[PDB]
Amino acid sequence: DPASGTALQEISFWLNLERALYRIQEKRESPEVLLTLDILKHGKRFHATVSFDTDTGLKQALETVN
């Protein structure tokens, strides 16, 4: 709820979401996770690979965050 808590709590909450979604992007961009993605791509299994960026709402969340 946008009015739940005081003003500084909600404002700080949006700030927390910004840096936290960047940390999720950090965990996304590691070479180990990319190695698993390469396994699924090299194994002709496009499902988890395309869903890793589309099914995850991280992209749109990061653009609204930005």
Partner 1 sequence: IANQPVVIDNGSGVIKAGFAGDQIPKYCFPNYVGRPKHVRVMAGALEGDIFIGPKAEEHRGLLSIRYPMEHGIVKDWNDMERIWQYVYSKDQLQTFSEEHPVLLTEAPLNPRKNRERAAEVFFETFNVPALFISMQAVLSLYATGRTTGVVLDSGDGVTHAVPIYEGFAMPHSIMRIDIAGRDVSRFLRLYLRKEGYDFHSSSEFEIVKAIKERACYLSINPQKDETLETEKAQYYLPDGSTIEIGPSRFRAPELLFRPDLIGEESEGIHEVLVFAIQKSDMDLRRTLFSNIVLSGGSTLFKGFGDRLLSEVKKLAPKDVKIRISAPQERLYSTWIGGSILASLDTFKKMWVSKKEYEEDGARSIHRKTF
In the complex, which residues of this chain contact partner 1 (CB under 8 A)? 44-47, 50-51, 54-55
What sections of the chain are H helices per DSSP?
A: 7-28, 31-42, 46-54, 58-65
Do 53 and 59 touch, CB atoms closer than 8 A?
yes
Min separation Cβ 19 and partner 1, Å:
28
**Dihedral in degrees, nearest 10, Cα atoms 13, 15, 21, 27:** -110
In the complex with partner 1, the residue whose CB is nearer, 27 or 45, is 45
Min separation Cβ 41 and partner 1, Å:
11
Min separation Cβ 49 and partner 1, Å:
11
